[PDB]
Write a protein that binds this ligand. Structure first.
Ligand SMILES: CC(C)[C@@H](NC(=O)[C@H](CS)NC(=O)CCC[C@H](N)C(=O)O)C(=O)O
Ligand SMILES: [Fe+3]
Length: 329
């Protein structure tokens, strides 16, 4: 069998308040989990995840093939050259099971200075017709801000955990310019499930998505109650239990770079499971020009032999690399 990964449940509610000592005790828990398997569940987070799941299901189960082409990213529809990140990511029956919808900062409007400058990684979201999907856009935009709020609180815990002031990361995570994204991923139940949509790991495990490190500062994930994730540890790949009441949190490779691998970006993969389920990540990305000077909390002077990297450079190249490694989603 496969061993269960150590993934503690951390009550993150003090990170929304002003009890500094209580916040330090949460930071310690974040530190411990980040130094161990690299994963934890954030609980007492204040977000209505049952309603998120319900609204997402209503969207996934009612969108039609016509609407998917009309919302498609450039990888599926050559007419949409501006849609690299935001839009619909189609399934390919018989070959690719997964499908999803990605959206960015709602403040990336046509008049936004980065949209006017045509800066890479910034795009204006595309949405289905309101009459076909009543309330969806409004729900989705509000969800972006609710999960942004949780992510800001989490970033205060990570900063304190690293011996910094609580705004160390959060000062670079702002509503007017964050490159953060929400992805509403549908993993379907299929009968027969196409073998071409099932990958096989070197250890024989059937997968839907191969091993990788995340392209993010941190990743804030809701998933249905169907076990699927595995994390590589010193004892090998271990199963991460599902918890559809909490948010699964881990660091991405920007955090590993900034901390000189004190907080590693854990390697993880997605097992193949023949079940209708949801995987709804929020990728906590900073602004395009955000630069955090690398440091090392294991070194007496805190210095590291790594060079500063702008978040926009990191992101554009990371997303392309992930597609080259693990395939177009
Ligand atoms: C592991 C889950 C987070 C999920 N995987 C994922 O979402 C995988 C690996 S973290 N992520 C990506 O492909 C990056 C999507 C980036 C997004 N188009 C954007 O422009 O910002 C899954 O369930 O497969
Ligand atoms: Fe990941």
């Amino acid at each position: 069998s496969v061993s269960k990964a150590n993934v503690p449940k951390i009550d993150v509610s003090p990170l929304f308040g002003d009890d500094q000592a209580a916040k330090m005790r949460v930071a310690q828990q974040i530190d411990a989990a980040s130094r161990d398997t690299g994963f934890f569940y954030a609980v007492n987070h204040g977000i209505n995840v049952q309603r998120l799941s319900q609204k997402t299901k209503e969207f996934h189960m009612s969108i039609t093939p016509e609407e998917k082409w009309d919302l498609a990213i450039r990888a599926y529809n050559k007419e949409h050259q501006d849609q690299v990140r935001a839009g619909y990511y189609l399934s390919i029956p018989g070959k690719k099971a997964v499908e999803s919808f990605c959206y960015l900062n709602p403040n990336f409007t046509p008049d936004h200075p980065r949209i006017q400058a045509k800066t890479p990684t910034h795009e204006v979201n595309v949405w289905p017709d309101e009459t076909k999907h009543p309330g969806f856009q409004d729900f989705a935009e509000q969800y972006y801000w609710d999960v942004f709020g949780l992510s800001s609180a989490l970033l205060k815990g990570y900063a304190l955990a690293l011996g910094k002031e609580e705004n160390f990361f959060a000062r670079h995570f702002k509503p007017d310019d964050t490159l953060a994204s929400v992805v509403l991923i549908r993993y379907p139940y299929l009968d027969p499930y196409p073998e071409a949509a099932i990958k096989t790991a070197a250890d024989g495990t059937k997968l839907s998505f191969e091993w990788h490190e995340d392209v993010s500062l941190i990743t804030v994930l809701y998933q249905s109650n169907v076990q699927n994730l595995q994390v590589e540890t010193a004892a090998g790949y271990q199963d991460i239990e599902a918890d559809d009441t909490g948010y699964l949190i881990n660091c991405g490779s920007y955090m590993a770079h900034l901390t000189n691998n004190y907080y590693k970006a854990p390697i993880h993969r997605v097992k193949w499971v023949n079940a209708e389920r949801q995987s709804l990540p929020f990728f906590v990305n900073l602004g395009y020009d955000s630069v955090i000077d690398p440091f090392d909390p294991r070194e007496p002077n805190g210095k590291s032999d790594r060079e500063p990297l702008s978040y926009g450079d990191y992101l554009q190249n990371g997303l392309v690399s992930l597609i080259n490694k693990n395939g177009q989603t």
